[PDB]
Amino acid sequence: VNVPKTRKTYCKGKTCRKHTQHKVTQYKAGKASLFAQGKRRYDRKQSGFGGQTKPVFHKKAKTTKKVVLRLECVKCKTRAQLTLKRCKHFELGGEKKQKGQAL
Amino acid sequence: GKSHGYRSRTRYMFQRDFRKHGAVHLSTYLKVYKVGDIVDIKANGSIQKGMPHKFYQGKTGVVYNVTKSSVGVIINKMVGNRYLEKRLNLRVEHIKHSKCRQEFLERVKANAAKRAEAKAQGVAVQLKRQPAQPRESRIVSTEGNVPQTLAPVPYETFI
Amino acid sequence: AKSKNHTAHNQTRKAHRNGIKKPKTYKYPSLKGVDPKFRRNHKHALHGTAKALAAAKK
Amino acid sequence: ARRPARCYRYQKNKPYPKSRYNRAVPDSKIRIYDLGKKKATVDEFPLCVHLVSNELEQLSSEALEAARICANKYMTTVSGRDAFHLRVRVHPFHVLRINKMLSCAGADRLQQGMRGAWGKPHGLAARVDIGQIIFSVRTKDSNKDVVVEGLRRARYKFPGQQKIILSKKWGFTNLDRPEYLKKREAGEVKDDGAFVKFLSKKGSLENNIREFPEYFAA
RNA sequence: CGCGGGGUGGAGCAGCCCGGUAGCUCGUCGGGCUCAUAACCCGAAGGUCGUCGGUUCAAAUCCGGCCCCCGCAACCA
RNA sequence: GGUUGCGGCCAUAUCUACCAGAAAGCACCGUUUCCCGUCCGAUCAACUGUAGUUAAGCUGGUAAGAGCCUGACCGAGUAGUGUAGUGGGUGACCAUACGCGAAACUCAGGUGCUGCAAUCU
RNA sequence: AAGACAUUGUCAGGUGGGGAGUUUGGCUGGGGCGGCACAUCUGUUAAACGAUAACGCAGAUGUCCUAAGGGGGGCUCAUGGAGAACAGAAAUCUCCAGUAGAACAAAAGGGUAAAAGCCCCCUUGAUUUUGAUUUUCAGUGUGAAUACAAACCAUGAAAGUGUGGCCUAUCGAUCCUUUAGUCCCUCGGAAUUUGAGGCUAGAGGUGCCAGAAAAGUUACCACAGGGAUAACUGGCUUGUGGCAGUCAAGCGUUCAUAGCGACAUUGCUUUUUGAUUCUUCGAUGUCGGCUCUUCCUAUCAUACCGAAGCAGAAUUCGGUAAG
RNA sequence: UGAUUUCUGCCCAGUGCUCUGAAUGUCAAAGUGAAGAAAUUCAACCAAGCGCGGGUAAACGGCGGGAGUAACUAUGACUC
RNA sequence: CGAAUUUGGGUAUAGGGGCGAAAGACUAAUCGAACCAUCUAGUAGCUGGUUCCUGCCGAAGUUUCCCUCAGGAUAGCAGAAGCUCGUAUCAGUUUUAUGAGGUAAAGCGAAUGAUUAGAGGUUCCGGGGUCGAAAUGACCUUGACCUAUUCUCAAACUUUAAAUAUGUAAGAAGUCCUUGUUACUUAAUUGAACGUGGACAUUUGAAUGAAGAGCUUUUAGUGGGCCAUUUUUGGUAAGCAGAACUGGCGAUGCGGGAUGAACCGAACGUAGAGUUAAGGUGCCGGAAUACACGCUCAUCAGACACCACAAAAGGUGUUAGUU
């Protein structure tokens, strides 16, 4: 798909509360930080003898991930996330569709 | 695999009509529905928003809510061994008033008129309706109507 | 070892044992699901009606 | 080689014609439906004899072709070709499926049994009812007996029970012989190449007059 | 130890929307060849398009007791 | 009664051919300065209603018109169908009893009615 | 002799079926192979409310789209006829006819003509909040969503329309991680910072799709059961195998049925093989042969006959007939 | 593998086994430097291994099609 | 049968270990992991059993989810305890009025798809023959194509369109004047909703019935079903497999079908009398070797549904029926 880099949408930023321009980016999962409680518990459970202690997924079926757009308001720098439907190809740069062109 | 969608097996049911395709006449939009009115559901295939389910196609309910372009209708649907009250947000194109309720209200007004007439003079109005009584005795004449005798006809191929 | 898949046999009899009796109706049905604008107006109108009725029969 | 019409006799299934879902059925064994002088006229051949069915069954295309060939051959042999017109009034449109099985050893181990038993077409048949006309022979009273015997032979070829009826209509039309006679002495009837054209009380009078000139000017 | 996708003739192929009213490669010492002669080559051409019966409106390309390539059994636990 | 504007029912209103239309009520126009829009004042926009036709859009009328509506003791109580039998029949199917009840065919009639407002020999 | 190196101890990486533990889906005309009928959608089975099965039939889904979403305006499409130099069956232009026979992302079914199709202009309502409602439903959840409410916008002159795609499919729990949001609450002796844990909404995924973390073999095998289920017989059926009729186009050197007999059609038979799973899995001893008795007739021979394309002699067809 | 006799043909692509390192490869603990107020990042022919290369079949093993071609025909010494 | 010989005794090797000229062999009748005791009364959705009587009520094999398919939860069916209330807000029923349907049927000179045959006019390309050296100067065909047309059809076609089923309503929570309130709505005391005052009795607004309406809690068993008559799918068919409605068997005896889970009657406390149902009345066997009219003679008669079989074809056997 193709999605514009700018988007006029509602901004609930305690100052805007109205439609406003947003810079559009794709949400990145971020680094899974050490010292999270779940990671600490997992490390404690994995330490020692006994082997693997929690399930490891293997039966992957989806060939697509849900693309989530993060919108940064140009007014108050407030961020809002919205997900889209599954799409194999995603694009932020906008090459506009040409209707009456050949080839 | 089996298919049970929202509009499954609704081909002919939601088929619009013969020579009644296209835009809808504006009487349907001009009709007025208030809370408590009994209305009939007949889905319009050319209108896709506010469409009722095929189960409620052909059912009759009571208006409980009124909105911009829609109406809330209450239908008792048999689920297992009981009726549950289902509330639908149908559109005026799919919805239509009830001639049965109109006739009953007309009969109520008439009945009140006859009761007022009875209070005026008391002529044994007999407010209630009665079923088809057996026909009483009558005398039928034969002048100009002498009985023409009929007999069974013999079989013939007629091909 | 296949088995019977589905049937509606005996279902209507089981329903009609103590079944298809109509649901009970009430005066003043629940005002949920109706337009909230109408709900606010009806609330204010009912308050005013109660006040006026008390004033009429003090 | 072919499974019997005893097995494929009765109207057990729904009509299953060759359509965009069948898309693969064999061609019928009977492709010709008119024999004799089909170019004749209702004036030429007055008498109609019908071979009709008294049963609600199916007749195979093969049986139809056999009866057709036998009746036509007998008629041509005995009375000559230019003495009759034979039209078969049933068309084989209901295809018949067959679930092919293995007649070998190890069949019980590599046959799969009744799983996936939907069959594929191997023949066609026509679904007749009680009183449906199967054969119609248009001929003369000098050939009445010959056409009756030919229809008897076709009956022998056909399954079930069939009757032979001397139709009271004029040939292949739908009008009784007095009625056709009166119209033809009048002018509401005028011959086409094979069938006949009829005058209508309604319609465009000038079109009728540029046609049907005899009735108006007679 | 069956039945079929096809037999044109000493070796093979039908515009399969079933009106086949006259197709392609072989022999041919004909043509030329520094071996009195060898490889090589425009062309006259035999088939009603497998011995026989029914479709037979003109038509032997559809059905049949001819062997085959193949698929799944010399049949019984 | 004609006509216009807004319509309701959406062919008894549509389609083909032809004939008629006083007076009122859209017209080719004079036009392109302005508003506006196109390759093209053809469509759309705009200003004059002035020299001018019933052209004919429109309306009405006519066709043993097509179609479309309305009926019928025409088809036909027929096809089908609910209920019943220790009914018939090898069966396929069929008849009967208590009820319901078609369509196609065949004839007959019709070919817009009407609401609001304005206007017209 | 060797020497701060070997060795020994601890931790870390690799190797390690030598060994240990465990697993190695389901449906299923027995299992296995195949397939997905496992989560879904269209039409039909489906028998005119709704519901309704089979490994039923014809198909389709896990995508695609900043436009193929939203609003407004203008035009009418597929085809066919006539006409215009190259130009012809098909290039562009112009009339006429054109109820849609076109197109609308896909599969099918609906739906749409001053549009829901084509083109042009603007645009992000594919936005926020949490309620109610329909569909499978237990009236639970997921998936879509019908109508509102409170805002903020888009579009249009305006009426209105818009909470993604004209509608019916196009999808995902706990735990964990991660991101956004008055930086709001907590770190429990008092605190400032870092860090961590919470509240409310998304994403990272479970296609066995209400969601286990998972390779085989056993003819050395074991246990609990099952005739809910296969391998015998028996039972229903007879496609198939076998046998027998009817009709007669033809074959029999002119001379249809002496003897055969195409096309078709009607049956019978449980000596074939299929189909089924009814009995038997706390056992009915399983192929063949040998031996022995009896029964059937659809008669090979023997008895007596009828018919021949019976001359005689062999033969062929048929009748009574299983002694 | 299985006396004697006569031989033990080709193939190291794959899976194994084995052998020194060219080093934009991968590269753990402990170590070394940045930053921070302190728990919270890179650099190291990084060690061995893996990967990249070389050997090895009396290691496990493997060891192919089609077509045209000769003076009856047939086959194909020959060729692609 | 002079040896890789046979053998006593003493020794060593001990259970995931030993030993094995190799058979998964032997290891105290135990070996594809000995024996002993304990953990241990191991677990078992799987078999088997589950002990007194009577009375009353009394099922289910179906919905959804589950590595779910021999099992559970869930809903449903059932019991018990009751609670609020006196001829009740009711009904597996009909009538009246008013909706919805696209199945049976029907139709194809109505749309789509399939399909037989002409005839008429064919000149916008196609084939050969005769006028035979000139194009739209002629005819027969394919038919770039209209009918008076014509024969058949459709589960995934349809204008039309039943029967049976199916949604509502038949009033007091109703019908008519005061608009009283409103922050909703209207140009507007205009509407919307709710309501105060007043009028309506033994026809309070169809029939029939009601065996007391209504309501709550809690829990058992069940979650293998099978069989008629109709509708109906796959299959040649099946005492086959799979669906719909209803009724049954399971769970149920009784009279009849000789015999039989389902068929026909009819359901059940203990007795008596009478009458019947279905089925029967020659004898078995209770009841007419009744009455009346015909038909049939079989050197395989026929004899009472489910049902325990028979066909096409043929016969001046015999009987009865247009010309």
mmCIF file of C-alpha atoms (C1' of nucleotides) in Angstrom, chain F residues 3-118:
data_model
loop_
_atom_site.group_PDB
_atom_site.id
_atom_site.type_symbol
_atom_site.label_atom_id
_atom_site.label_comp_id
_atom_site.label_asym_id
_atom_site.label_seq_id
_atom_site.Cartn_x
_atom_site.Cartn_y
_atom_site.Cartn_z
ATOM 1 C "C1'" U F 3 -50.242 25.597 -19.974
ATOM 2 C "C1'" U F 4 -46.332 26.256 -16.485
ATOM 3 C "C1'" G F 5 -43.503 25.352 -11.669
ATOM 4 C "C1'" C F 6 -43.275 21.799 -7.696
ATOM 5 C "C1'" G F 7 -44.911 16.858 -7.327
ATOM 6 C "C1'" G F 8 -47.789 11.633 -5.482
ATOM 7 C "C1'" C F 9 -48.768 6.898 -7.536
ATOM 8 C "C1'" C F 10 -44.373 5.200 -11.151
ATOM 9 C "C1'" A F 11 -45.825 2.302 -18.626
ATOM 10 C "C1'" U F 12 -53.808 2.668 -18.388
ATOM 11 C "C1'" A F 13 -47.829 6.953 -18.195
ATOM 12 C "C1'" U F 14 -43.399 3.234 -22.514
ATOM 13 C "C1'" C F 15 -42.093 2.335 -27.854
ATOM 14 C "C1'" U F 16 -43.244 2.634 -33.762
ATOM 15 C "C1'" A F 17 -45.926 5.335 -37.662
ATOM 16 C "C1'" C F 18 -49.224 9.384 -39.024
ATOM 17 C "C1'" C F 19 -52.218 13.665 -38.208
ATOM 18 C "C1'" A F 20 -54.047 18.187 -35.306
ATOM 19 C "C1'" G F 21 -52.899 22.177 -31.933
ATOM 20 C "C1'" A F 22 -57.052 29.243 -31.105
ATOM 21 C "C1'" A F 23 -54.939 31.979 -26.737
ATOM 22 C "C1'" A F 24 -51.588 31.767 -23.084
ATOM 23 C "C1'" G F 25 -46.826 29.056 -21.233
ATOM 24 C "C1'" C F 26 -39.651 26.391 -22.929
ATOM 25 C "C1'" A F 27 -37.839 28.323 -28.500
ATOM 26 C "C1'" C F 28 -33.425 29.823 -33.649
ATOM 27 C "C1'" C F 29 -32.030 34.115 -32.122
ATOM 28 C "C1'" G F 30 -29.835 39.961 -31.332
ATOM 29 C "C1'" U F 31 -25.965 38.524 -28.901
ATOM 30 C "C1'" U F 32 -21.080 37.726 -26.351
ATOM 31 C "C1'" U F 33 -19.332 43.765 -22.155
ATOM 32 C "C1'" C F 34 -19.756 41.615 -17.561
ATOM 33 C "C1'" C F 35 -20.209 36.177 -14.038
ATOM 34 C "C1'" C F 36 -18.817 31.401 -15.864
ATOM 35 C "C1'" G F 37 -16.927 26.930 -18.903
ATOM 36 C "C1'" U F 38 -15.487 24.315 -22.923
ATOM 37 C "C1'" C F 39 -11.039 22.201 -28.975
ATOM 38 C "C1'" C F 40 -15.846 24.516 -30.296
ATOM 39 C "C1'" G F 41 -21.310 30.412 -26.322
ATOM 40 C "C1'" A F 42 -22.736 22.782 -29.468
ATOM 41 C "C1'" U F 43 -23.503 21.839 -23.608
ATOM 42 C "C1'" C F 44 -22.987 25.321 -19.438
ATOM 43 C "C1'" A F 45 -22.883 31.039 -18.024
ATOM 44 C "C1'" A F 46 -24.751 35.832 -18.980
ATOM 45 C "C1'" C F 47 -27.688 40.384 -21.064
ATOM 46 C "C1'" U F 48 -31.966 41.863 -24.405
ATOM 47 C "C1'" G F 49 -38.384 38.825 -25.132
ATOM 48 C "C1'" U F 50 -37.071 43.182 -29.710
ATOM 49 C "C1'" A F 51 -37.421 41.682 -36.859
ATOM 50 C "C1'" G F 52 -39.709 37.330 -37.082
ATOM 51 C "C1'" U F 53 -42.552 29.713 -37.558
ATOM 52 C "C1'" U F 54 -45.858 25.843 -35.097
ATOM 53 C "C1'" A F 55 -40.293 24.370 -36.580
ATOM 54 C "C1'" A F 56 -41.663 20.997 -33.507
ATOM 55 C "C1'" G F 57 -39.481 19.872 -28.305
ATOM 56 C "C1'" C F 58 -44.530 19.694 -25.648
ATOM 57 C "C1'" U F 59 -49.825 18.292 -25.650
ATOM 58 C "C1'" G F 60 -53.865 15.866 -27.875
ATOM 59 C "C1'" G F 61 -55.965 12.432 -31.472
ATOM 60 C "C1'" U F 62 -55.653 8.098 -34.708
ATOM 61 C "C1'" A F 63 -53.645 2.314 -35.545
ATOM 62 C "C1'" A F 64 -58.500 -5.197 -36.150
ATOM 63 C "C1'" G F 65 -50.314 -1.448 -33.506
ATOM 64 C "C1'" A F 66 -46.278 -3.881 -30.109
ATOM 65 C "C1'" G F 67 -46.117 -3.523 -25.022
ATOM 66 C "C1'" C F 68 -48.419 -2.604 -20.435
ATOM 67 C "C1'" C F 69 -52.766 -2.699 -16.770
ATOM 68 C "C1'" U F 70 -57.944 -4.781 -15.462
ATOM 69 C "C1'" G F 71 -61.260 -8.847 -15.304
ATOM 70 C "C1'" A F 72 -63.945 -13.845 -16.692
ATOM 71 C "C1'" C F 73 -68.943 -19.691 -14.228
ATOM 72 C "C1'" C F 74 -62.371 -19.460 -20.933
ATOM 73 C "C1'" G F 75 -58.373 -22.652 -19.756
ATOM 74 C "C1'" A F 76 -59.712 -25.163 -14.959
ATOM 75 C "C1'" G F 77 -61.700 -27.038 -10.126
ATOM 76 C "C1'" U F 78 -57.414 -28.847 -14.323
ATOM 77 C "C1'" A F 79 -51.256 -28.941 -12.583
ATOM 78 C "C1'" G F 80 -49.772 -29.027 -7.789
ATOM 79 C "C1'" U F 81 -50.552 -29.677 -2.647
ATOM 80 C "C1'" G F 82 -52.059 -30.656 3.414
ATOM 81 C "C1'" U F 83 -54.637 -34.794 5.815
ATOM 82 C "C1'" A F 84 -56.527 -40.731 5.629
ATOM 83 C "C1'" G F 85 -56.946 -45.862 4.591
ATOM 84 C "C1'" U F 86 -54.543 -53.407 6.478
ATOM 85 C "C1'" G F 87 -56.832 -48.413 -0.976
ATOM 86 C "C1'" G F 88 -55.146 -50.406 -6.348
ATOM 87 C "C1'" G F 89 -50.469 -51.885 -8.448
ATOM 88 C "C1'" U F 90 -44.229 -56.293 -8.918
ATOM 89 C "C1'" G F 91 -43.117 -51.471 -9.377
ATOM 90 C "C1'" A F 92 -43.234 -46.958 -11.699
ATOM 91 C "C1'" C F 93 -47.036 -44.594 -10.142
ATOM 92 C "C1'" C F 94 -52.562 -44.142 -9.792
ATOM 93 C "C1'" A F 95 -57.701 -43.498 -7.985
ATOM 94 C "C1'" U F 96 -60.809 -42.147 -3.961
ATOM 95 C "C1'" A F 97 -62.398 -39.347 0.859
ATOM 96 C "C1'" C F 98 -62.034 -34.517 3.846
ATOM 97 C "C1'" G F 99 -59.856 -29.513 2.130
ATOM 98 C "C1'" C F 100 -56.722 -25.604 -0.336
ATOM 99 C "C1'" G F 101 -55.907 -24.299 -5.110
ATOM 100 C "C1'" A F 102 -51.966 -22.235 -9.891
ATOM 101 C "C1'" A F 103 -49.501 -20.552 -14.199
ATOM 102 C "C1'" A F 104 -49.353 -20.599 -19.362
ATOM 103 C "C1'" C F 105 -53.393 -20.389 -22.924
ATOM 104 C "C1'" U F 106 -58.551 -17.883 -24.767
ATOM 105 C "C1'" C F 107 -61.650 -14.008 -24.856
ATOM 106 C "C1'" A F 108 -63.324 -8.896 -23.153
ATOM 107 C "C1'" G F 109 -62.216 -3.838 -21.709
ATOM 108 C "C1'" G F 110 -58.726 0.289 -21.157
ATOM 109 C "C1'" U F 111 -54.285 3.317 -23.162
ATOM 110 C "C1'" G F 112 -53.066 7.885 -17.261
ATOM 111 C "C1'" C F 113 -55.414 9.562 -12.705
ATOM 112 C "C1'" U F 114 -54.521 13.096 -9.244
ATOM 113 C "C1'" G F 115 -52.545 17.211 -5.168
ATOM 114 C "C1'" C F 116 -50.656 22.450 -4.312
ATOM 115 C "C1'" A F 117 -49.694 27.296 -6.600
ATOM 116 C "C1'" A F 118 -49.897 30.517 -10.795
#
